[model samples]
Each structure stands twice: as structure tokens, then as C-alpha cells.
Target: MEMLTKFESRSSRAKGVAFHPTQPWILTSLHNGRIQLWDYRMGTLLDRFDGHDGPVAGIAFHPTQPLFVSGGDDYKVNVWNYKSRKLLFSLCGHMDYVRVCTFHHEYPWILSCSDDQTIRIWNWQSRNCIAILTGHSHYVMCAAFHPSEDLIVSASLDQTVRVWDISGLRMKNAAPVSMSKEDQKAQTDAIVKFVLEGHDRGVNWCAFHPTLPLILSAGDDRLVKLWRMTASKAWEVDTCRGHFNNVSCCLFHPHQELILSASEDKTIRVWDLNRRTAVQTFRRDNDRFWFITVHPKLNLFAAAHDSGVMVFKLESAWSHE
Candidate 1:
């Protein structure tokens, strides 16, 4: 792996990092409850925000706006206008520490998971709770919205992954006269559609395919599992096993039929989704992998761990193939 850039921050451990959708800013969440924005290309710090009382677990930028959202162990979600370096509003509802929060690509909704055993959908514009999904009996570690479907997928310490339909919740408030009991019931049912159980231990992360309705998940089970919907309904398709310790994260390659998994075993493995087998393994001699993300617009990927954050290019693998 090639180390493109090394950005330094507060002494506390960094929990998450995200690249802006259209800008050159890279946002990093630190255990010190601070969010740092960096000029990723120049390796310079641009801005920072401190308000949460606990460790920030996840960060995400809006797909088409100048705003971003973050969730932390404080059980709060904060929305910020990063351009102005101001906090727009704080979303308060989750009873326990909030673990993950992300924005919907085309909607004004923010999806969040928490240690309180629930996933919530917040209307970002109105700053109101639109829906609450409850099923997982343990801490929820990660939650994400599908790119094209009105579906939300989440993974939890309960050792299961769930899919929720959110299409009806997208209706706009026209007038009180337009409201009906049936409409409200349809919206409530849209909160949860299916629950998938397969992982042998706590599931740490779950992510949807960028272009397909498929999902990739990993966790304390020490394995990676992939699920896809059949013509009748969504279901678990297969599992990929190789890691010797808990798998921390797994992501689908943006443009290829491959998947990448990082584990506490100090290794990252690349898998061919079509073949359902590990293709390449990258071992870190002294660091444990915590999380990973694929560049939305580049053929590059990055991982953050104990040693430091590292980047890798796909060219070498393409050449080897």
C-alpha cells in the first residue's frame, strides 16, 4: 500500500473519516468529541467543531448541500453548515449513545442508529423525528440508506441486519385536510420490512452496494456476509470467511464486482464477489484495522487504524490480474 498523505490531529484516537461529496475537504471525527476538516490534498487542517460530550462515531456530508451530520457516544446527532462553521441544529432522541448517522442521497432525511436499540429517521429540514424502527435488541453499530431504493439497512450488536422501507415517509405535508389514518398507518409500516439473521456475533457494520440492492456486512463474527434480494424479497445470499478475528468493516468496490474487508486480525482482504473467495490479502505488521472507506470518485481506498490512516491504489491489483 502507498501512503499518499498522513494527517495529524489531537492526541485522542480518530473514530471516523469522510470525504466531502463535491469539495476537497476530508472530515475526521475524533475521540475527543471534535470534528476536523482537512484540505486533504495539502494535508492542512481547515476547520474543527467541538460540542459533543463523548466520542464521535460517524460523520457524513450531504450529497448536494453544504451541510454535514455527525453522531457520537453522547446520544446526539448534530447538523452543521461546515461552510460557515456553525451548528445548525442538534437532533436529540436516541436514549443511548448514537453510533452512526448518514443522509439520504435525494431526501431531506438523516438515518441514525444507536446503542438504545433503535434506528431513527429524521427530517433534516424540519428537524423532526419522522419514524422510529425497533427490532434489534442490542446496540446498533451502523446504519445506511440505499442509493436508489427507499430502503434503510442497519447492522447491530444483536447479530442481525435489517431492511426498512421508507418510501411512504417521503410524502410532504400538504395540509391537515390531506391527512388520513390509512396514510399514517402506511408510513408506520414503512419503517421495517425485513430482518436478516446470520452473523454468529455482534455485527459491527453494514453497507449497501452503490448501484445494486445488495448489501455487505462484517462484525465480531470474524466473517464477511453478502445479501441480496430475490424476485420475491430480500434475503441472505452468501458469506465470505477468512479473517481470524473480528471483522471491523467491509465495503463494495465502487466500480468493480469486488469487496474489501478489514479486521482486528491486522489484515485487509480483497474478495471477488462473483467467485465468493478472497483474492488478495494485505497485512499490517503492527496495526489493527478499525474502519475503511472507498473513494466515491477515485480508484483509491483508505483505512484508519492503530498505527495511522493509510491509502491504497487499485492499479497494482489490476496489473496483477
Candidate 2:
């Protein structure tokens, strides 16, 4: 495997980073509560969005929409139309810092996890909180939608990972109709499908495999775990142990049999998915990494660190300089 830094920007600490699905744009959320849109291809700053009152922790671009969503320490999730460079609206409900906000791959829904110990599913088109998944007894660190299913997965400070089935939510909202009180209550119940309890400390991040029955999670325990789920059960398959400090984020390579994790240990470790062993390690001496995101259709990835963000590619290309 080959790796190279394609672009690097110096700025204040960054907490979140996201890549546009079909564009050369990358979004970085800074510790100073600002979001910067950069044209990575040109190595230019395209625009800056100043909306959050505090640090923005999570940012995501819609898979096929002209929009992006952000969650911040202000406890608000704001959706913006980048095409018009305007705030479309804010989804307000979280009582504490919002940790992560993500758009569903094929639905008009947004998933948000918060320090308030709740994970919420919001209907972006309706601008309403359609579901409040309340089970975690501590702060919910991250939540995400499965790429090709109605399943939701979340990691929490409670030291557990929970999988939720949201098919009921889809059935209830896909058609607009009046319902009886009992039916309303039943429909809004996004049932927990599984509670994976293996992490010994707070789990910071969890994500689904793009094309498999696997789930990946990383946590304060300094371990990366892989879990497999069948139609009826989910269980731990293996753990990738290398990071000596809290693992902040972990994600699967979009088209490869690999896993990548960022840690407070000041290193990003790449693992061979099949062998569950370290393949490569990238280190920064002064910065602890916070987040990682991959370009949907390219070999590139962007990671947020204590001082700024770096755009890199897994395969070598002609030098930009």
C-alpha cells in the first residue's frame, strides 16, 4: 500500500472533517466554531461558514442533495445549502453538546448523537425530530445510518454500542396519514436490535461496513473492535489492538479491505481488515487527531487534528507541487 499527503492546511484545532460526495470540496469544523469549505483540487479556501456558537464537532454532506449538516457545542444541528451558501434551518432539541450529525444515505433523515445521552433521528425535509432513541445511560458519542439498510448504530460513554432498527420509523413517516394514539406510539418506537457490550471504556466512534454485515467501533479502551451481525444477533468477531491512547475515530476504506483509526495517541493506524493486523501507521508529533472522512468516489481521505486538517491519498499520484 502507498500513502501520500496531497494537501495540508495550517489553522486552529479542527474537530470535524467531511468530503463532498461528488465534488472536490472538503469541509472542516474548527475549534473556534467556524466551518471552512476548501477546494482540495486547487488547494484554495472556497468559503467559511460562521453559525455555531461554540466548537462544531460533526459535519456531513448529503449523499445526493445540495445540502450539508453540522452539529455543535451549541447543542444545535444546522443544515445548510452550500450551493446558495446559506443556513437552511436549525434542528434544535439536544440539551447539551451535539457530538455527531450524519445524513442518511437514501433517506431524508439526519442522525444526531449528543452529550445529553440521546440519539435523535430528524426528518430534514419536515424539520422535526421524528425519533428520540433513549437508552444510553451516558453521553452518546456518535451515531450513524447504515449505508444500505434501515439500521442505526451508536456508541456511547456508557461503554456500549447499540444497534437500532428504524424500519418502523420509515413506515410511519413515508406516508402522511392520521393515526390513533396507540398507533402513533408504536410507530415512533425505534426498537433497539442489539446492545454490543465489549468495550471496557467509553466508545467514541462506531460505523457500519459499506457492503458487509460488519460494524467497527473504537473507544477510550484504546482498541478497535469488529462485530458481525446476522439477521437475529450481533457479536464481536475480533479486536485490533495497537493505539496506546483513546481511539477517537475509525472507518472502513470505501473500496478496500482495510480499516483506519485515529487516536489521541497522536497516530493514525491502518489495519488489514481480513487479518485484523496493522498495515501502516501515520503519526503527527504535535497534534492529536479527532476525525476522519473519505471522499466517496476517490482514493482520498481528510482527517481533522489538533492544529488543522490533512488531505491524503492511499495510492501515489503525481506531486501537486
Candidate 3:
């Protein structure tokens, strides 16, 4: 199949990209320490946020607020009030460059993965470090919260994917005001529920199904693997193989029974769920697609590549009504 490009533009190499919850706006994190927001439909650059001291790879917008959060090589997570173009606050604790930072669905907590072999939780509102999860001996590549569960899943360069149970983690009661840093870490480590072991090389990304106990992870070994997890244990379900090089990231279609993956081989492949085969593959000659993001309220998606970012309507047509 073919992916018709809806819009494309040139800029510095993109390390990450995010689409707004309810707008034509798209944000790109570049290696130049710049975050640029573009009006995709109008093909105009609306604004540029320059605050990170080095290159940034993590960027996300609040689901229903006029805010966004970013993390970078500066080892800091910056929360911004985009409406006023002001820096709300900077959350610091990571010992190395943060690879990715994500917000909780119904809490003020921030989940961050870093090269320092740790994942951290921070109360963005209180500016406090809530917890520190440590076990991986290598970089923690990515971490995400379950959409409607008190659970967290993370991938690491240690070639392991771990699931953490935060059902007992409460913001109001997040640890007594008296525990020292060491005690806090012990409390956090006790919440980890399962360790998933599969994948030949360092895991690049891992994400939970929006509404299930399933997982999707891509790795440097050039494979996208799917797994199923339960309270007692977890096991690999299947693998989608085709990428000629490292598989960078993979995500389930927001409203479809499909999976989309991008690779360092300079291609993006859409895999069929049941058949587990590549149905559509997209590529640009010199552009290696680095990231993929879904539209919040549309059957569309965006990919960040070497040349720039491109928007594509997943269904070929979108209903305006």
C-alpha cells in the first residue's frame, strides 16, 4: 500500500514530535535544542520554544489543557504554560539526559526514562520527586502510563521490559513526609510487578494497549514484538519482522486493529493485526523516520524524519461532519 503525504516541511533533524489535542498544530523537538510548533493545514510556523540547553527528544502536550512538557540532554523536564508562552517550572533529578517524559492521565505526576539506568516519577505541581524505580543496568529508553489503570510499563537497553504496579501509589499519601531518599527508593522498587524478558538487542520502545493487558515493543534487533501480561506472569505473543535495521518505535492504530512501526532503515510499515504482515510501507530516500504520533481526534498520524515531519490521513479520507 501507499501513504499519500498530506503535508511536509523542512527543518533541523527531528528527535521527537507531538500533535496537539484539538488543533492543526504539531510540535517537533529538534537536535538544535529548539521546539517548533507548526500549523500543518496552513503550512505556517506559529512559534518556537528555545529553553533546553542541549538537544531534546521528549515532548508532550496536556490532553485537555493549554500546557506541554519537555525533557532533554540538559537532564531537566520543563513544564510550560503555552497560552502565555511562559515556563511554569523545571523539574530536576535525572542524572543523565532524559530520553522521554510522559504525563499521567489523571494525576499531576510525570514519568521519565533516562540514560542513567533509572525511571523517575515527579509531582509536577508540587515540584517534588515522588519515586525512583531502579533495576536496569543500562539506559531506560521509554516509559508510559496505562490509560485507565494504576500501572506503568518501561523499556530499557538492558534488553528487558518491566511492568510496575502503581495501584497503591497515591499522590496525597505518596510516602510520608519523613522518609529519606534511600527509603523512598525502596518503597518505589517494591511496586514492580513483572519483568518481561524477550528481544535480541536493546529495547527501543514499549507501550501498553489502550484498553488491554497487551504490550508492543520494538528493538535494535530489527523486530517488533507483542506480548500478553497477567498478574502472575507475562509472555511474548508474536513478532512482526521486516525492518532491515533497528526498529525505532511502534504504536497501535488509535481506532483500528493494526500496528504501525518506523525504522532506522528509512521506512515506516503498517502491519496487519491478524495476518501479522506488512500491509503498507512508507519511506523517503534520505529521511529516516524517527518517531510516530497519532492524532487525538482524527484518523491521521504524523512521522518525524530526517528531512522533516509529514502528516498522513490513515483512512485516506476524513469526515468533516
Candidate 4:
């Protein structure tokens, strides 16, 4: 009927969390400027990493590397080698808070969004900024890469979601050729493929569908919006309204027809993707939920909130006799 808690730990406010793509470890970044690496299976705190001068709002694990990336209020994106327990380097460009930074699924790239109203892609291998997408008029709250394509999705305080095509960025990087001044300007304008404007309030998070031409976004409007895109256009398909407070994060379940959202109202609501209706709700009396993410290959979900983080199962494997 409700989420089954597998494990939980209490701490300072957890701003973000990520599961190791292949390990039993989970990394959580806190508002207190520290990041914790926990062995979720053994229920032990493995280690702590601190470099950000202020709150570390974004944290993620590299799928195939011994590294992780985090963004903070200090406007820096720091990459760390988890094995060596050392900071590899920092990527700097944003003038304001670095909201969130994420790694591309199949590339040596990292995507970051900031309150500076811009999104930048960096090649971690070369330690160079590859592309800077600037079209959002307000704080770009979150940005992410499409799992299998050269597409990017961004959400902002301007109450809009934008989909960008980075095929040109890839092309130019692969073959750096001199270009005319006007031609360069036209190339930049061609990146933005669709601008979805339906949210009534600032959007906090938006993510691409792992395998479909779809996107999911949550916002201050307390709504979860589902959008669909095609080769030519994109539009909002539906909205799931239930949260009584601002929705901080939302994601499409990788292997299920479901959407999960965490809100400041102290609840994590699961919605049926097809019907766009609440299927179940997990509520906390005092701790407001912040972020929710799924295990890459397991039927497990992890959520960070005011008090800490919890790993849970959405449904029981066996039903009552």
C-alpha cells in the first residue's frame, strides 16, 4: 500500500543524493557543506568529503569511473576521485550558485545548470568547457542530458522548460573548423529545439525519459508536468496536481510506468505514468522531502529530505496469501 523502508539514516538536511551505478554505496551531499559516502547495504558511513565552502546542493556518481561530481552554493563544480579520496579538479564559470551538475550517460561530459541563467557542458577528459547554452531568463534550476541522444533538458525560475539539441556541439568538437561570424550565431540559435511554457511558477527540476521522447518537471506551482517531444515540436501532455507545497524534484521510474515526486509538504508521491494519477503517497510528519532517485538496476529508490535519506521499495515482491 505504501513504500517499504529498507534502510534509513538521520543527519543534517540532505540536498542531493546518488547511487553508485554498480555498487551498494550511496553518496549524499548536505546543506552543511559536507558529502557522505555510505555503504547502504551495511548501514555504515564509509567516508566524508568536504571541499565546498557552502552548501553542496548537487552530487552524482560516475557510471564507469572512480569519480563523482558535485555543485555547490560557491558556484563551483568539483570533481573527485572516490578511490583516491581526492579532489580531481574544479570546473568554474557560473557567476551564481551552481544548482546541479550531472554526468552524461555515455560521454566524457558533465552538464551543469546555475542561478546565472545558463547551462554549460564540460568535457571532463580535457577539463574544458565545451558548450554554454544561454536562453533561460532566470535561474536555471536543473539541467540533464538525454540518456541516449545529444539532447538536453533544462528547467528554470522563468516558468519554462527548454529542450536543446547538442548535435552541433558534438560536430564542432569532433571537427573544429573555422566558421563565419554570422554562421556561428545561427548555430547557437539552432540549439534550442523547444521551449515548453506551462508551469505557472518556478520549476525546480526536469528530467528526460530514459528511452522515450518525454520529459518530467516539478515546480513551485506544486505540479508535476509531463511533456512530449517529436522531431519538430514539443508540448505539455498533462499535469499531476496534488502536492500542497513546492515540488522540489521529480523523476520517471527507469523500469516502471511511474513518476515519483518529492515535495516541501513532507511527502513523496508516486504517480501512474499512463494515467497521471497518484498511486501512492509516503508522508513524513516533520521532515520535508528534497530529492528522489532510483537505483540503476535494482527495484530500490532513495530519497533525501530535511532529516536525512531513506532507501525503500515501492511495492512488496510477494502479496499476502
Best by lDDT: 2
Q: What TM-score against the true fold does each predicted structure earn?
A: 0.89, 0.94, 0.91, 0.94
- Model 4, residue 203: C-alpha shift (Å): 0.5
Give the residue spans of candidate 1 off by over 4 A: 1-11, 172-189, 318-321
Give the root-mean-square deviation of each candidate in angstroms.
3.5, 3.0, 3.6, 3.3
lDDT (Cα, 0-100) at 166 in candidate 1: 71
lDDT per residue (tens digit) for residues 61-108 in model 2:
998898999998999999999999999899999999999998987778
Clashing pairs in 3: none
- The residue-level lDDT of candidate 4 at 4 comes to 74
What is the full ranking by lDDT, best candidate first?
2, 4, 3, 1
What does candidate 2 score in Cα RMSD to the true structure? 3.0
What does candidate 1 score on TM?
A: 0.89
Residue-level error in angstroms, candidate 1, position 171: 3.7
| Candidate 3 to native Cα RMSD, angstroms | 3.6
lDDT of 3 by residue, 1-321 (tens): 446567787987888888897888888898889998888889899899998998889999888778888998999999987889988899988999998887887888888989999888888888898889888889998899888877888999899888888876663466556746765664343287887887869998988778777889998989999888777788888899999998878888767778899999999999886678878787779988788887756877888888788887765333220
Candidate 1 lDDT score relative to the true structure: 0.81
lDDT of 1 at 311: 50
**Model 4 agreement with the true structure over 1-321: per-residue lDDT tens digits:** 457787788998999999998889999999999999999888999999989998998899988989999998999999999999999999998899998898987778999999999999999999998888998999999998888877888999999999898887766656756767876654462288888889989999998878888999999999999998887888788999999999999998888899999999999998999999888888999999989898878978899999999988877335420
After superposition, which runs of candidate 2 have C-alpha atoms over 4 Å from their true positions?
Answer: 174-188, 316-321
